Symmetry: C2
Subunit: 325 residues, 2 copies
């Protein structure tokens, strides 16, 4: 109970202490888990704490060694309910480089990653061998978090009972057991930009963008996006739709995973609504930039827009087929 006492007194844990905190949490009674999650949330987190917890979560996870891979994710929470751009970006990115998309840590999955992918015809539960098969021949696989993180099984009831944002919203994206070399990570508030960028440094990522787009855990196609770039230290800069070569446009809402799937598929096949296409493309651009496929965000968008068409729809068919074979 000394770690709890440390947290309640307003003291930030070390990396090593946060690592041991995860391991205490996975074998604790619900009462103590609840106390820890609530207390840590009230205090707020540093990058060392996030990194420690994330490292522990990865170490406890079902083992998989795909290549050097990229991943795109968000903390979620957010507020508004738009289409799942991190899924579309990950699919578009697989046209250029190896992608291992880590699944939704949160239960609130309306227009959510696993759900959109199921609706697009994938089997979302894939063994580590099947995952490797999928990355070798299609450059895409999906890592479904409940399947790959058995240590969370006792944590999940406690997260439902509490019904608040916890640290598990934030470390979900940082706990991909494939150890992605490249990451785009969206955060729901500007206050998570610094901790999350720092945590990705501790986790030894090659290149990463931590993004916040004016109230969204995504790159905005309308107003400005705050970016922290991790790689040669940490670099802060601001983007706008002009930087991707598009006219500002407001993304429009989404009702259900089936609506999400159809709109994404429309965009992936070279068609779809402008507000969906440009929103997906600015997020795809960031992912191509983070992966080192594109030199800048304008080129990232150019390349992603050109990947859209019949070839992307047959790529999606082959991913689906291969997930169920």
């Amino acid at each position: 109970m000394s770690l709890l006492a440390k947290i309640v007194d307003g003291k930030n844990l070390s990396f090593e202490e946060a690592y041991e905190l995860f391991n205490e949490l996975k074998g604790s009674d619900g009462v103590l888990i609840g106390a820890y999650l609530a207390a840590l949330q009230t205090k707020g987190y540093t990058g060392e704490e996030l990194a420690g917890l994330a490292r522990a979560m990865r170490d406890s996870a079902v083992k998989l060694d795909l290549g050097k891979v990229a991943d795109t994710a968000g903390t979620g929470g957010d507020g508004s309910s738009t289409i799942n751009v991190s899924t579309a970006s990950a699919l578009i990115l697989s046209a250029f480089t190896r992608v291992a998309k880590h699944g939704n840590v949160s239960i609130t999955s309306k227009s959510g990653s696993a759900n959109v992918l199921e609706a697009l015809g994938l089997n979302i539960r894939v063994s580590p061998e099947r995952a490797r098969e999928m990355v070798e021949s299609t450059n895409f696989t999906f890592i479904f978090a409940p399947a790959y993180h058995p240590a969370l099984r006792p944590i999940m009831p406690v997260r439902k009972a509490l019904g608040i944002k916890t640290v598990f919203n934030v470390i979900g994206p940082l706990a991909n057991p494939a150890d992605p070399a490249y990451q785009v990570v969206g955060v729901n508030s500007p206050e998570l930009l610094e901790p999350v960028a720092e945590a990705l440094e501790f986790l030894g990522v090659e290149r990463a963008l931590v993004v916040h787009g004016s109230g969204m855990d995504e790159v905005s196609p309308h107003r400005e996006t705050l970016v922290l770039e991790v790689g040669n230290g940490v670099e802060r800069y601001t983007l706008s739709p002009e930087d991707f070569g598009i006219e500002p446009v407001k993304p429009l809402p989404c009702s259900s995973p089936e609506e999400s799937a159809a709109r994404i598929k429309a965009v992936l096949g070279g068609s779809g609504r402008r507000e969906d296409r440009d929103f997906i493309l600015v997020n795809a651009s960031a992912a191509l930039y983070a992966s080192g496929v594109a030199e800048d965000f304008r080129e990232g968008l150019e390349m992603a827009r050109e990947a859209l068409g019949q070839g992307m729809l047959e790529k999606l068919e082959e991913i689906a087929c291969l997930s169920k074979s």
Copy 2:
């Protein structure tokens, strides 16, 4: 889960919300109680929150028809473990006015109030009718919190499992179901002075002293004591051993409740160690002052010192006898 969300976001609850929080806590699973206790501890408390919780706890408690009564108590969890002066003060105060001493909710119960009283020969669990019998004929009774607060039955396991200070350490002294008109309340840090004084205002106390004696939840017989006096608004002042008419003396540690009982009994009978006698007497003085029995702290000590002797030991015999009859 909106009250938890409110707390985790750094918002102070209102009196009314803290009142409803108590009632939610008494019918909740341990997981949610843990989350609440830890989160509220990490945020800190205002006087409205303490008062709300304390008011709710009193309202849920087994009812009592004692007189206008006085009480003396501490939050506990101070620096370390000296003898239980709040028990001795309460006993000495019963020579002059009606006293209903509220029992330790607290886990720091080595040399703790119920334990010291058990060691002095009392049955510490008394029915409300027996409590009234004891106040009518001896001016003293002891209200054992676990017996009088059935709402704590789910709360107490959660407090043991967590093993940190919670809000229940602070509201225990504020939750005497007899509704004492007069109170001395010791606090373990200067930061609790203002909240606790404010909470006693909300709880409609006639006169109260909230005291902190240089690292102790008691009036110090060595160094200075910070006092907040509640009555005609709130008055701040500092006391020293000179104000009671004694030479400074260091209170010395205690190993067990049986040692605590013997040292107290020695002092109560007119004898005992100087360091124990003067420490008990400065705390008794404050209680006589809070009760309006004494005009100032010097007179409070004079009166308390003169009450010590054979009459006090036979008073204690009759309290013990009457608690077990």
